[PDB]
Design an enzyme around this catalytic site. Structure first.
Site, mmCIF file in Angstrom:
data_model
loop_
_atom_site.group_PDB
_atom_site.id
_atom_site.type_symbol
_atom_site.label_atom_id
_atom_site.label_comp_id
_atom_site.label_asym_id
_atom_site.label_seq_id
_atom_site.Cartn_x
_atom_site.Cartn_y
_atom_site.Cartn_z
ATOM 1 N N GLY A 109 -7.340 -0.453 -7.976
ATOM 2 C CA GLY A 109 -7.029 0.608 -8.917
ATOM 3 C C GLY A 109 -8.263 1.379 -9.346
ATOM 4 O O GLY A 109 -9.000 1.892 -8.494
ATOM 5 N N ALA A 158 -11.083 0.275 -10.778
ATOM 6 C CA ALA A 158 -12.230 -0.623 -10.965
ATOM 7 C C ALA A 158 -12.370 -1.324 -12.305
ATOM 8 O O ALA A 158 -13.480 -1.590 -12.759
ATOM 9 C CB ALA A 158 -13.534 0.140 -10.656
ATOM 10 N N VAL A 183 -4.913 -3.180 2.000
ATOM 11 C CA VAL A 183 -5.041 -4.635 2.022
ATOM 12 C C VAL A 183 -4.637 -5.230 3.348
ATOM 13 O O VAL A 183 -5.423 -5.941 3.932
ATOM 14 C CB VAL A 183 -4.213 -5.333 0.940
ATOM 15 N N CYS A 198 3.859 -3.516 -9.119
ATOM 16 C CA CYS A 198 4.977 -4.139 -9.810
ATOM 17 C C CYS A 198 6.316 -3.446 -9.633
ATOM 18 O O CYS A 198 7.359 -4.089 -9.826
ATOM 19 C CB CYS A 198 4.704 -4.223 -11.313
HETATM 20 N N1 LIG Z 1 -1.146 -1.360 0.686
HETATM 21 C C1 LIG Z 1 -2.000 -1.204 -0.333
HETATM 22 N N2 LIG Z 1 -3.335 -1.473 -0.178
HETATM 23 C C2 LIG Z 1 -4.251 -1.329 -1.187
HETATM 24 N N3 LIG Z 1 -3.908 -0.905 -2.457
HETATM 25 C C3 LIG Z 1 -2.571 -0.648 -2.622
HETATM 26 C C4 LIG Z 1 -1.597 -0.773 -1.653
HETATM 27 N N4 LIG Z 1 -0.335 -0.423 -2.188
HETATM 28 C C5 LIG Z 1 -0.588 -0.102 -3.432
HETATM 29 N N5 LIG Z 1 -1.912 -0.192 -3.802
HETATM 30 C C6 LIG Z 1 -2.609 0.041 -4.901
HETATM 31 O O1 LIG Z 1 -2.171 -0.861 -5.928
HETATM 32 C C7 LIG Z 1 -2.888 -0.465 -7.084
HETATM 33 C C8 LIG Z 1 -1.989 -1.375 -8.025
HETATM 34 S S1 LIG Z 1 -2.220 -1.044 -9.706
HETATM 35 C C9 LIG Z 1 -3.346 -2.368 -10.114
HETATM 36 C C10 LIG Z 1 -4.262 -1.819 -11.180
HETATM 37 C C11 LIG Z 1 -5.661 -2.322 -11.212
HETATM 38 N N6 LIG Z 1 -5.818 -3.846 -11.275
HETATM 39 C C12 LIG Z 1 -6.438 -1.680 -12.429
HETATM 40 O O2 LIG Z 1 -7.005 -2.451 -13.213
HETATM 41 O O3 LIG Z 1 -6.447 -0.388 -12.544
HETATM 42 C C13 LIG Z 1 -2.669 1.026 -7.152
HETATM 43 O O4 LIG Z 1 -3.758 1.761 -7.774
HETATM 44 C C14 LIG Z 1 -2.302 1.358 -5.647
HETATM 45 O O5 LIG Z 1 -2.980 2.506 -5.146
#
Ligand SMILES: Nc1ncnc2c1ncn2[C@@H]1O[C@H](CSCC[C@H](N)C(=O)O)[C@@H](O)[C@H]1O
Ligand SMILES: Nc1ncnc2c1ncn2[C@@H]1O[C@H](CSCC[C@H](N)C(=O)O)[C@@H](O)[C@H]1O
Lengths: 186, 272, 267, 186
Positions: free
Chosen positions: C13, C15, C58, C81
């Site tokens: 997200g 950082a 990922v 989520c």
């Molecule tokens: N296949 C994928 N690979 C990498 N990131 C992904 C993904 N699918 C969704 N996301 C990423 O998942 C993130 C989840 S939100 C998680 C928020 C983060 N921990 C913070 O503190 O801001 C999003 O910003 C989105 O771009």
């Protein structure tokens, strides 16, 4: 409120006319016999000019007759007028009576009217002329507001002007209250 | 007995994003009152939030009267920059100095006159009025003839990463003296970009102004604030659009130039 | 003398992880993040000036990549989520849609945790909406082999964010604590000249005779981020909103990481 | 690469089968004579369980036959398989030969297949069955990739399954290479 002046101490009036002269119609009232300075294009007229032209008691200016006799956006007259009008004012210790007047020959929009009024600090006083087969004014000359005719409509007045494009006596009697401040001749 | 230096009371017309006050505070000059005539809610908000209320927001210029002026207490400084639009040689649709927004100028004039000390009062009084250099010869003249003075062209190019040539009318002391760079004054457009982006030109004025990690892009707002000399994130208020924000900074005063301009006030008013 | 932390952030997200890591004054040897959203990706890049080595999607990261990416001390993550949210009727659960993404976190966790025999210290954390299906909460717990620890940022910030937390970080259960500096009142987050209706966000503000919606500047401030932390692209408001929208509450995260000072290089 | 073991050092194999058992087909090869533990629903199966279920040398699991015999999104089998598969792994000091195999009965989408492969670290190996009037596999059992038939098409295979919804022998021969590592019976 200007404090009246006794007759044996009223000198000839010095008039500064802008965009149109009253040298004639002002004589007709016995205010002249020059004491009046006329100027057409004020473009480059600077402050010192308006001062070396000798002190003034009456500053007059009016829009050009309906027809576009000259080329220069309406407002111009108002703005420019306000300009020299200010250069013409007296000092803080108001020596004698000082008066000014701006007349519009149904040439300013209702926009330019708000400017004019807001700039000269007062609503105008429209005075008509009826005959059956045939102008707005701003000024501080006494009882000029009790002579207002809240009758004539705008719509009609607009019609009056629009018809004049496709084809004095008014204000002359506004100068009378000035008879009580300056010398009358013959 | 003692004639102490007192705080400055200012009247800003077409205040915009309160660069006037921003710079006044920058120079460390105490401000008794800062009365601004602004009609754009966006800019109005900026000022409101950035200077925490201090700015007494009056309304539209032409709703201010002589009665208001002397009632709003006597003023030491009167500054303003009427809208350039109808004066810009570039805008064909321009309605000149007498129509459109062009008129707004005389509003400044009218009010300047209602505020300047009357003959006899020797009280210190400073005023300043800006406008685009690229205007019609007639307008430049008339303005000069109304404000009874000639301007002073000055380009923020000499003290900031941008090309902003503007005319300046006024009686502020030393307006003609040459400008000077500061240890802190981003003059290179590169020195304005945020980390990880590279600049094409040395100064903005020739399309997208910066390239980034293999992509061609437009200037960011933080960077543009940084290009006029505003603090970073200075216009990060409201939820206005990038386009809005832009329009803000877009038509504002180059902070470096108003600092340069205001600078010699420090010797005439109380200091924080 | 302890060494610098080597972290792997999944679904990084904006950082928040590195932000807080720095806040606690913990030296960071490397911070590898897996992010696909360009907006968030830029934010991290600018805000931490490059330090973050940005991998890609990922599931484009492999076992080969992991031990090759150097060994990791910390693994953190919060998979999308949406497809788990009881609220979203269209949700496709933990096995379809974005739900699946979770396993990616599991897969990588597995590929990074020290092999039986290696006693090296290894910490990991994974978050997600409390409002999810009982079966999913189970499965997740069964996969990560442990139970969550519900914790709401309401106790340490002007907002209501009840989220589940799975992990091995020390003292994850101990109650939270407010700080001399921790805007708990929604009013203490608003910008000058605006009045707050509620005490905590879940037309929030009252501004000079006008009913209006929270400001991104105050929202960052609601979430525990520094003001202007998300003022980076020419990114629209909705975008900027979206970013923060889905992040972790910094206070809630400072809390969880806090104990980590005791094992790595104290910057 | 699993180092081949001499005959007199090949005990019976312990097999963990998930979602389906090979207790029968695995016997037909002389691998059995129990040594094989079968489990259907692993939802709540924890790590300790997979451990106390005695060491395993062969972990097998496969998708349910074409028809939806059970209700549970396809992926589930793969993910769950990967889970227990890991719980069943040996220790770092690899004692003996360890093998696993996951078979798909044409029930995983092409998406679910990228996951499956990427999760089990290898492309599958499609093994058909023709007759005229009438399965994908993942595993580390030797020479399982040189037995791949890069012939049968996907579009055809898709038609094979789509027609089976509107209405063993395959892998049985993949266990042969195991004969070289474990005890054979009669
Ligand atoms: N296949 C994928 N690979 C990498 N990131 C992904 C993904 N699918 C969704 N996301 C990423 O998942 C993130 C989840 S939100 C998680 C928020 C983060 N921990 C913070 O503190 O801001 C999003 O910003 C989105 O771009
Ligand atoms: N009638 C009116 N009265 C007062 N302000 C007006 C106006 N019409 C337009 N404006 C204001 O005109 C300004 C011109 S921009 C001047 C910007 C300024 N020098 C700065 O540094 O910010 C705008 O901010 C606009 O809101």
């Amino acid at each position: 409120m200007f404090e009246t002046v006794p007759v044996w101490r009223r000198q000839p009036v010095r008039v500064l006319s802008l965009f149109e002269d009253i040298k004639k119609e002002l004589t007709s009232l016995g205010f002249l016999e020059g004491q009046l300075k006329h100027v057409v294009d004020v473009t480059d007229t600077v402050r010192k000019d308006v001062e070396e032209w000798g002190p003034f008691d009456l500053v007059y200016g009016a829009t050009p007759p309906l027809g576009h006799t000259c080329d220069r956006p309406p407002s111009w007259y108002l703005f420019q007028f306000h300009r020299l009008l200010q250069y013409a004012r007296p000092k803080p210790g108001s020596p004698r009576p000082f008066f000014w007047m701006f007349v519009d020959n149904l040439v300013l929009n209702k926009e330019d009217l708000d400017v004019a009024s807001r700039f000269l600090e007062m609503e105008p006083v429209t005075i008509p002329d009826v005959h059956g087969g045939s102008v707005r004014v701003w000024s501080n000359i006494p009882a000029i507001r009790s002579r207002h005719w809240a009758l004539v409509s705008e719509e009609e007045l607009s019609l009056l002007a629009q018809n004049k494009q496709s084809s004095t006596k008014l204000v002359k009697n506004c100068f009378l209250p000035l008879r009580e401040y300056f010398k009358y001749f013959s | 007995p003692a004639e102490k230096r007192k705080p400055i009371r200012v009247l800003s017309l077409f205040d915009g994003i309160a660069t006037g006050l921003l710079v006044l505070k920058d120079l460390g000059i105490q401000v008794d009152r800062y009365i601004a005539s602004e009609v754009c809610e966006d800019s109005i908000t900026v000022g409101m939030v950035r200077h925490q209320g201090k700015i007494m927001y009056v309304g539209d210029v032409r709703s201010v009267t002589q009665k208001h002026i002397q009632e709003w207490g006597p003023f030491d400084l009167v500054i303003g920059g009427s809208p350039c639009n109808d004066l810009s040689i570039v805008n064909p649709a321009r309605k000149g100095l007498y129509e459109g927004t062009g008129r707004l100028f005389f509003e400044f004039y009218r009010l300047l006159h209602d505020a300047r000390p009357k003959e006899g009062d020797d009280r210190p009084f400073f005023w300043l009025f800006e406008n685009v250099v690229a205007m019609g010869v007639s307008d430049k003249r008339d303005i000069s003839r109304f404000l009874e003075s000639n301007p002073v062209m000055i380009d923020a190019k000499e003290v900031s990463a941008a090309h902003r040539a503007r005319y300046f009318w006024g009686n502020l002391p030393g307006m003609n003296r040459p400008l000077a760079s500061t240890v802190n004054d981003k003059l290179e457009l590169q020195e304005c970009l945020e980390h990880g982006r590279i600049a094409k030109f040395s100064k903005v004025r020739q399309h997208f102004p910066v390239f980034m990690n293999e992509k061609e892009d437009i200037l960011w707002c933080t960077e543009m604030e940084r290009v006029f000399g505003f603090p970073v994130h200075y216009t990060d208020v409201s939820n206005m659009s990038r386009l809005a924000r832009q329009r803000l900074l877009g038509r504002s005063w180059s902070v470096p130039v108003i600092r340069h301009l205001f600078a010699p006030l420090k010797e005439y008013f109380a200091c924080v």
